[PDB]
Amino acid sequence: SGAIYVGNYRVVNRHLATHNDWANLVWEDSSRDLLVSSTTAQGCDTIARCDCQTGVYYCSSRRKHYPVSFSKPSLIFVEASEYYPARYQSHLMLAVGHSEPGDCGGILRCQHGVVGIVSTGGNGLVGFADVRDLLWLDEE
Ligand SMILES: NC(=O)[C@H]1CCCN(C(=O)C2(c3ccoc3)CCC2)C1
Ligand SMILES: [Zn+2]
């Protein structure tokens, strides 16, 4: 579990969004596993605006932050799960690391701020849904 809190926005994994998130919806994209809902109070996370490919992520199943190298956001095939059929997930970045059911939502950060959140796992890999292209998160 986990979310990004920037301005009056809450960014979560679309497959983990609560009934309250859907009742206060701003934007969602199934192909990216992302959902953004509105908030009353202002958040303090800063979104990275960069092309960094090294950062640190939080892994809840190990209670540990890991430094990782990660690939550029791409269209990657993700196996069928209880949340989605087998499909290409877009804006996804992979790293060699630990990720198991329960780790989605963990923040990936670089020197510039928040890069994205854990969205995939298994096979000794971790996938992160990129949020650096969502420039609108910084305004309105
Ligand atoms: N974005 C998606 O389509 C994911 C939805 C949740 C499940 N997904 C995973 O990759 C798995 C996982 C491992 C660790 O966290 C999650 C489930 C076994 C691998 C796929
Ligand atoms: Zn960066």
From Swiss-Prot:
The active site is at residues 15, 33, 104. Coiled coil: none annotated. Signal peptide: none annotated. It catalyses: Selective cleavage of Tyr-|-Gly bond in the picornavirus polyprotein. Zn(2+) 1 binds at residues 50, 52, 110, 112. Homodimer. Cysteine protease that cleaves viral polyprotein and specific host proteins. It is responsible for the autocatalytic cleavage between the P1 and P2 regions, which is the first cleavage occurring in the polyprotein. Also cleaves the host translation initiation factor EIF4G1, in order to shut down the capped cellular mRNA translation. Inhibits the host nucleus-cytoplasm protein and RNA trafficking by cleaving host members of the nuclear pores. Counteracts stress granule formation probably by antagonizing its assembly or promoting its dissassembly. This is Protease 2A. It comes from Coxsackievirus A16 (strain G-10). The chain holds residues 869 to 1008 of 2193 of the full protein.
